[PDB]
Design a protein around this nucleic acid. Structure first.
Ligand SMILES: [Zn+2]
Ligand SMILES: [Zn+2]
Ligand SMILES: [Zn+2]
Lengths: 153, 376, 96, 88, 176
RNA sequence: AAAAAAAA
C-alpha cells in the first residue's frame, strides 16, 4: 500500500493525470442535441446500454458496460455507480479501477444540459490490501525488469 | 488502370462464392453504364482492380466514382443506370462514401451484384449497408447476390473465354441461397401484404398454395429470461426446381437448417428458435429437423403452422417423431398471425385485418393436431 | 545556488576531464552513476574520458534526471556513430 | 524549467533554472561556486556582451533554445575565451 | 435496485489500425515463429456484444489480453474513431489495466530478440554483436546510457512486416 | 470437407 500511494502521487500516471480534466459524452455525435440528451439520460436511468466519456484533448475514454455483458459477475469490494439524485441537472460517476498495478477511483460529473463536465482520479486505499498480495508482487516484479543485457548468451 | 476482360483462371479464382474465403486479397469490379429507356448496349463497360488493404482512394468503388463524376459531365441532362458485378461487397468506408455520392447525384441509379459479402458480421458494416440500401429516404441503391445468370453474364462479357461455355462450380446454388438469406437478414427485408394474405390463410380448402413460407426469430437465455437476438430474424421460402439451381428443388426447412450453423451459436448457452410456417413440414424435412435437434442439444425448436400438410399418412408419423425429438408444434392463432403481420410484413402502418372464419379454422386445426400428437 | 561545494554537503561534485576540461554537476545527478556514487572528498578525476565524452555523459545525467519519472512523450537523445564506441566505453566504466 | 551552459577558462557548471529568471539570478547561481560578487561579472552570448539588467524574454532566448539534450551555450568573464570542447 | 457496471479504459482507434494489428498478429503467429504461442480468439468465441477479437499473450505464468471493440457509439462525427482497444494483465482472478507502452515493455520481456549480456563486452573487443535488438517498441522508457550507445553503434533490425506493437495500435493520430 | 478472411 505505501508503494502504491507513492507511485500514485509521484509517477507520471498512465497518460491519465489525476488533475481535473474536462470530459464529454461522445455518444450519438451526429443526432441533434435534444436527441442526444434524451438518449443519454435514458441510458443512465436504464442500465441496459453502454456509456462512454472521453477526455476532450486526448484519446482516452472511460466505458461503462452493463455488468451482464461481461458474463460472470466480478466480485466488487468497492462500489461503482451512476447517480442521478445529488443534483437536479448533474450525473455523478464513480468507477473503481486498477491501473498499472495501483488501485484508483475515477470520479466525474456530467451536466445533462451541456453533455460535458469534469473528471478526476484519486487513490483507493480500501481495496489495495484486500487484493491478492501474490499477484501484486508478481506484477511489481515484472514491471521493474528490463529486457536489455538480460539473456545469458 | 482498367482492363477490358479478365482471364479464365482469374474469374474462377475470384468469383467463387463460398461465403468464407481467405487469400482473395483483390477486389474486381466489372461495371456497365446505360441510359434509362428501351434496352440498348452499354455506353461503357470495363473492369477496375484493387487490393483490400490499399488506400481508400485506390479501391475500385472510389475509382469508379471518380471516373464517373468527370465522365458524367459530357451530358448532364442524361439519367444513367449503373450495374456492378463485384467479387467482394464494398467496405464500410466505401459504402458510406457511395451513399454520399448518390445523395449528391439524383439522376443516377445503382445496382450492385456481389459474389460474396465482405465482413457481413460486422455491426458497423451492417448499419452502413442499411443506410445505403434499406433507407428509402436515402439513395436509390440496390444490392443483390450473384446467381447463375449473373455469373454467366460475367463469363460471357467480362472474361477471355474463347468459345468455352460457363461451367458452374459444385455448390453454386447452396452458397447463393445462404448468402441470399444472410443479406435479407441484414437488410431487414419484409414480406408484401398480398403474399402474406394469400399464403397464410388457414382455410382448410386452399387452391394454389404450392410454396411454403417460413418466418424465423431467435432468443437467448439469460437471467432466466428470453432476450431476443434482433440480428437473427427474417423469412424465407422454398426454392422451385431449376436446372441451373437445385435440380429437385430445396424445401424451406432444409434452407433454414443450412443457415443455422453459420450463426455460430455458442454451445454453452441455450437458444430458442421460433418458426412460423404456412405449411407444416413434410416427412423428409421433419426427419431432418428431428436429426438436427437431436444433435444440437443447445437449441430448442418451436413451430407454429397455419395449416397441417398431410399426404399419404407419413406426415403424421413425421410430426410425431419431430415432437418426440423435443420440438414444440402448435397451430397459429390470432395472436401469432397478428405478431407475424406486425413483425415480418411491410404493413406501412396498416393494422392486421383478420379474414373470415379465422378462429373456427384455428380451433379445428388445433383439435386435429392434438389428435395427431396423442394418437400413435 | 547557495550550496557550498567546498563543504561536506557540496551541492556540486567536480569532474575533471582527462583532456583538460573540468565540469561540475549536482551530487544527485552524479548519483545516477554507480562508480561516482560509490566514490563520493568532493573531486573526481577521470584517467581516460575525453572532454567531449564527459560533456555527453553529463548531458545524459541531466536528461535522465529530467525524464526519470516522466513516461510520456520522451524526446530523442542524439548520438553519433563516430562517438558511439567511446561513449559506450565511458558508460561501461561509469555503470551509467 | 530549463538547463544552462556556462563555459569560461576551461571551467563549466551545469544547472537548471526557470524561464523569467533575470541575469542577476544567473550571477547568484554562479556566485556560490565562483565566490565572486554578482554585479562584477558580465555574461556573453554569441560573442555579444550582456548588460547587468537582462531577462530571458528580452534576450529572445526561449525554452526551445535550451534543451536537456542541447542546452543553450553562453560564456562568462571576470575582471573572454569561447574554448571549444575536445575533438575525436 | 441500482444498476451494475464494468468500467474499462478504451483507446479510440480507427478500424484500419485494428485490421492491420490483426493481420500482423496472425502473420507472426503462423507464417513466422516469432509470435508463436500467442492465441487469437474470433468474435464468435466471446459472448460480449461489443468484443470484436481478443489476442492473448502468455507472460510466464501471467497473461496479457488485448481486446478490440465493435459498435461503440462513441465513434467520431466522421467515424474516425468508432472502434476501441483495451489492454489487461491477468493472473488467476487478479486483473489490472495496463498502459500501451508498459504493455509493449512487458511483451518484450518474453518474445523477440534483444542484445545479450555479452553484447557490451563483444562491442568493445571490436567483434560483431549478435543477436541484436529487433523490437524497439519494447525499450520505450529512459534506458541506461549503455543501451543507447550500443543501439547507436549497431542499428536494430527492421522486420518486414513489422512485429505487432500495442503502442502503434493505440497511438493518437486524430488529435495528434 | 476446412478458410470469420493482408495467414500469400
Ligand atoms: Zn472500399
Ligand atoms: Zn418438406
Ligand atoms: Zn530489445
Amino acid at each position: 500500500v505505501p508503494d502504491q500511494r507513492s507511485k500514485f502521487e509521484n509517477e507520471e500516471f498512465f497518460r491519465k493525470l489525476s488533475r481535473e480534466c474536462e470530459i464529454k459524452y461522445t455518444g450519438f455525435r451526429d443526432r441533434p442535441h435534444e436527441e442526444r440528451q434524451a438518449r443519454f439520460q435514458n441510458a443512465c436511468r436504464d442500465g441496459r446500454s453502454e456509456i462512454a466519456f472521453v477526455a476532450t484533448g486526448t484519446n482516452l475514454s472511460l466505458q461503462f458496460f452493463p455488468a451482464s455483458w461481461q458474463g460472470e459477475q466480478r466480485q466488487t469490494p468497492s462500489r461503482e455507480y451512476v447517480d442521478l439524485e445529488r443534483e437536479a441537472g448533474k450525473v455523478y460517476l464513480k468507477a473503481p479501477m486498477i491501473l498499472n498495478g495501483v488501485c484508483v477511483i475515477w470520479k466525474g460529473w456530467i451536466d445533462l444540459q451541456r453533455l460535458d463536465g469534469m473528471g478526476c482520479l484519486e487513490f483507493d486505499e480500501e481495496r489495495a490490501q484486500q487484493e491478492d498480495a501474490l499477484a501484486q508482487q508478481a506484477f511489481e516484479e515484472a514491471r521493474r525488469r528490463t529486457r536489455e543485457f538480460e539473456d545469458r548468451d | 488502370n482498367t482492363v477490358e476482360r479478365m482471364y479464365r483462371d482469374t474469374f474462377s479464382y475470384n468469383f467463387y462464392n463460398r461465403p468464407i474465403l481467405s487469400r482473395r486479397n483483390t477486389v474486381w469490379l466489372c461495371y456497365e453504364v446505360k441510359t434509362k429507356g428501351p434496352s440498348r448496349p452499354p455506353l461503357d463497360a470495363k473492369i477496375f482492380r484493387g487490393q483490400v488493404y490499399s488506400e481508400l482512394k485506390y479501391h475500385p468503388e472510389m475509382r469508379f466514382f471518380h471516373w464517373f463524376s468527370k465522365w458524367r459531365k459530357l451530358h448532364r441532362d442524361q439519367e444513367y443506370e449503373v450495374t456492378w458485378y463485384i467479387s467482394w461487397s464494398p467496405c464500410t468506408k466505401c459504402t458510406r462514401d457511395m451513399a454520399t455520392f448518390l445523395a449528391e447525384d439524383p439522376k443516377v441509379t445503382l445496382t450492385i451484384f456481389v459474389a460474396r459479402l465482405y465482413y457481413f458480421w460486422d455491426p458497423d458494416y451492417q448499419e452502413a449497408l442499411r443506410s445505403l440500401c434499406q433507407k428509402r429516404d436515402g439513395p436509390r441503391a440496390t444490392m443483390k447476390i450473384m446467381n447463375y445468370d449473373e455469373f454467366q453474364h460475367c463469363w460471357s462479357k467480362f472474361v477471355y473465354s474463347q468459345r468455352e461455355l460457363f461451367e458452374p462450380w459444385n455448390n453454386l446454388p447452396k452458397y447463393y441461397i445462404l448468402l441470399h438469406i444472410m443479406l435479407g437478414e441484414i437488410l431487414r427485408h419484409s414480406m408484401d401484404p398480398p403474399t402474406f394474405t394469400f399464403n397464410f390463410n388457414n382455410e382448410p380448402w386452399v387452391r394454389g398454395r404450392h410454396e411454403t413460407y417460413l418466418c424465423y426469430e431467435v432468443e437467448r437465455m439469460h437471467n432466466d429470461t428470453w432476450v431476443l437476438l434482433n440480428q437473427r430474424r427474417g423469412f424465407l421460402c422454398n426454392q422451385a426446381p431449376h436446372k441451373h439451381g437445385f435440380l429437385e428443388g430445396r424445401h424451406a426447412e432444409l434452407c433454414f437448417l443450412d443457415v443455422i450453423p453459420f450463426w455460430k451459436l455458442d454451445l454453452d448457452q441455450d437458444y430458442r428458435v421460433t418458426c412460423f410456417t404456412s405449411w407444416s413440414p413434410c416427412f423428409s424435412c421433419a426427419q431432418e429437423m428431428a436429426k438436427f435437434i437431436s444433435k444440437n442439444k443447445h437449441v430448442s425448436l418451436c413451430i407454429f403452422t397455419a395449416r397441417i400438410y398431410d399426404d399419404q399418412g407419413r406426415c403424421q408419423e413425421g410430426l410425431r417423431t419431430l415432437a418426440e425429438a423435443g420440438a414444440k408444434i402448435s397451430i397459429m392463432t390470432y395472436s401469432e398471425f397478428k405478431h407475424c403481420w406486425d413483425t415480418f410484413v411491410d404493413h406501412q402502418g396498416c393494422p392486421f385485418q383478420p379474414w373470415d372464419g379465422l378462429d373456427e379454422h384455428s380451433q379445428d386445426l388445433s383439435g386435429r393436431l392434438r389428435a395427431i400428437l396423442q394418437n400413435q | 545556488t547557495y550550496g557550498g561545494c567546498e563543504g561536506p554537503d557540496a551541492m556540486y561534485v567536480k569532474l575533471i576531464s582527462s583532456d583538460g576540461h573540468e565540469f561540475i554537476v549536482k551530487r544527485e545527478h552524479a548519483l545516477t552513476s554507480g562508480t561516482i556514487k560509490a566514490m563520493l572528498t568532493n573531486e573526481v578525476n577521470f584517467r581516460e574520458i575525453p572532454s567531449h565524452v564527459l560533456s555527453k555523459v553529463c548531458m545524459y545525467f541531466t536528461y535522465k534526471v529530467r525524464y526519470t519519472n516522466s513516461s510520456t512523450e520522451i524526446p530523442e537523445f542524439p548520438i553519433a556513430p563516430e562517438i558511439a564506441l567511446e561513449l559506450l566505453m565511458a558508460a561501461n566504466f561509469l555503470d551509467c | 524549467d530549463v538547463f544552462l551552459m556556462i563555459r569560461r577558462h576551461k571551467t563549466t557548471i551545469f544547472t537548471d533554472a526557470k524561464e523569467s529568471s533575470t541575469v542577476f539570478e544567473l550571477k547568484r547561481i554562479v556566485e556560490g561556486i565562483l565566490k565572486r560578487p554578482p554585479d562584477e561579472q558580465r555574461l556573453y552570448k554569441d560573442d555579444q556582451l550582456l548588460d547587468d539588467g537582462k531577462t530571458l524574454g528580452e534576450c529572445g532566448f526561449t525554452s526551445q533554445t535550451a534543451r536537456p539534450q542541447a542546452p543553450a551555450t553562453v560564456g562568462l568573464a571576470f575582471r573572454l575565451c569561447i574554448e571549444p570542447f575536445s575533438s575525436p | 435496485m441500482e444498476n451494475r457496471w464494468q468500467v474499462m479504459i478504451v483507446w479510440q482507434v480507427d478500424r484500419m489500425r485494428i485490421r492491420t494489428w490483426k493481420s500482423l498478429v496472425k502473420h507472426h503467429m503462423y507464417v513466422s515463429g516469432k509470435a508463436r504461442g500467442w492465441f487469437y480468439r474470433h468474435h464468435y468465441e466471446s459472448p460480449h456484444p461489443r468484443i470484436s477479437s481478443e489476442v492473448h499473450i502468455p507472460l510466464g505464468d501471467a497473461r496479457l489480453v488485448i481486446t478490440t471493440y465493435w459498435g461503440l457509439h462513441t465513434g467520431e462525427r466522421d467515424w474516425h474513431l468508432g472502434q476501441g482497444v483495451s489492454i489487461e494483465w491477468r493472473k488467476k482472478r487478479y486483473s489490472t489495466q495496463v498502459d500501451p507502452e508498459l504493455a509493449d515493455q512487458l511483451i518484450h520481456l518474453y518474445y523477440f530478440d534483444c542484445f545479450s549480456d555479452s553484447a557490451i563486452r563483444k562491442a568493445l573487443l571490436g567483434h560483431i554483436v549478435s543477436p541484436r535488438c529487433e523490437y524497439q517498441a519494447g525499450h520505450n522508457k529512459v534506458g541506461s546510457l549503455q543501451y543507447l550507445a550500443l543501439a547507436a553503434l549497431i542499428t536494430p533490425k527492421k522486420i518486414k512486416p513489422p512485429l505487432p506493437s500495442v503502442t502503434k495500435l493505440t497511438e493518437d493520430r486524430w488529435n495528434k
